Design a protein around this nucleic acid. Sequence first.
RNA 1: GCGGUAGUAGCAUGCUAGGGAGCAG
RNA 2: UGACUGCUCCCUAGCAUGCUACUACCG
Lengths: 187, 190, 78, 104
Amino acid sequence: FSSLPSYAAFATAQEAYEQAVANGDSEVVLKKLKKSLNVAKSEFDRDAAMQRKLEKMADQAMTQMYKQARSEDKRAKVTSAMQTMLFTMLRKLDNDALNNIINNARDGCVPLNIIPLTTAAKLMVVIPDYNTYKNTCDGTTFTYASALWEIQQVVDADSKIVQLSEISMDNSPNLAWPLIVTALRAN
Amino acid sequence: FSSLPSYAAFATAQEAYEQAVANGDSEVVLKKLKKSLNVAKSEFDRDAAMQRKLEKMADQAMTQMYKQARSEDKRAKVTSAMQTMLFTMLRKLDNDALNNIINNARDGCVPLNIIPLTTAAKLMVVIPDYNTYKNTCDGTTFTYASALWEIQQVVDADSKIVQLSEISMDNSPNLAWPLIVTALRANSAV
Amino acid sequence: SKMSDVKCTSVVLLSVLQQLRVESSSKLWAQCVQLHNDILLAKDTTEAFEKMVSLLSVLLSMQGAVDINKLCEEMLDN
Amino acid sequence: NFNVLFSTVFPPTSFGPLVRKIFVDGVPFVVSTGYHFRELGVVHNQDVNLHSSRLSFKELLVYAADPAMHAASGNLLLDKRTTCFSVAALTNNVAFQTVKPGNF
RNA sequence: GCGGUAGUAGCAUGCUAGGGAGCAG
RNA sequence: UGACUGCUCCCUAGCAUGCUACUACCG
């Protein structure tokens, strides 16, 4: 704390008294010098701690306000944060069935109900283009979620039944394409 | 802190004493200066301390009385709210059936569990599944508590209207099953 | 380490599903809660994975909900 | 000990608070002025006034905590989810409450 | 020459009051 | 929508006590 007038006064008094004492002198001069020195020393010493307490208190207050602002900010982006985190962990898991269904949904082939686990029960998906049908459906079997399923019904956007033999490269582009395959889980 | 009653005397004595010191007079005037200034500062000390104590005492008293006033205001508003709630719920007592069953008592006292059982106008039934449904409220009118009730509305756990034509054995697994049935007292109260 | 990862992922997935107002459909919410509670009690790491597939199918079969493709182009899921 | 054994014969709708009608500035109320315990028998209140002027704060507090008015100003309820005795429903809807998962 | 008293500053000790959090039945 | 107890840690404010220090009064 060397930026206060009290420090300047105390330093000048210290220098004057020290020089006078080192020069050598009587008792009355020493007494007068110390009576004029100690008041300035106390004046300096009070502020020397008051300033420190003020500075640390200000630092703590700024810390607390930063923490409050950050918490208020954080509690307002939870949906996006959670979605990003979930997909990061889904990457890190690295499973074949999960990767299969995520890529299928990313290209457009999403399911319509909860995927069953038993050797029975119906599953319905939507196939929006011929390329997805070429990749997944070949023959009369269906490969989805690293499993095997058996096609039993095909329905178009007009809800008319389409037989499996109908679908072909050039024979397809005269149809309502968002097909709906309903299959059951092969053993 | 600058216009205290003793401030004038203290400052005037200090100024006069320091002028005498600056006059370069003998040591007796210096001793008188020192004594007078010492006693002046000593008397200024308590005048500067007691006032500061008193101000803080007064501030504490003001704060306490303000919070007391706020507490009284809150009490008044909660009293008004409770009175309003009681007088609002009073207006649905059906004061003819209640009077009819009160007068039959031999001294005016009746169990509380039989007041809704004999004077209520509406009945609500919660049904877990279809097997329980077909044994309790099958059809459009059923009997319970020695009275006849007729159905008025049926909703599901999601609070959406459900028609009785689709509450069947085949269509049972397609409903949010905690069904709620509402009926009215027939021939009696509503 | 392959089991705690799937349990944490299931917790995050259930939180994401709850954020999308799924509990406004009692049957779907009951099924999701059952699956989530069953995953956390698993002991072997095959049943947990099939239940995880079943639970993720619920989120995937909601068209508007989220953007699978944007959330896959942010140096995220492949 | 004897009351516990003997109370299993009598109907279960005759137990609980006993209510009656009192008048406050000419309007009728319904308040509880006793109890019928399965163990302690019949108990009657000692300070009950039928006709009274406008009531104070503690009387409001006492009358707002009694289940008598709430039960008497509600609908009948028959709940088949549980086997415990049911009294009344305070609203026209049934509330379903869920529990959310944790944060990671 | 020693002690007493009156303010002022720093430090330590135990309570009361307010706020935030953790565990257990 | 958030019960009754018990224990512990952290931060601030006040009170009481003690230690040291600086001036001043008194003998």
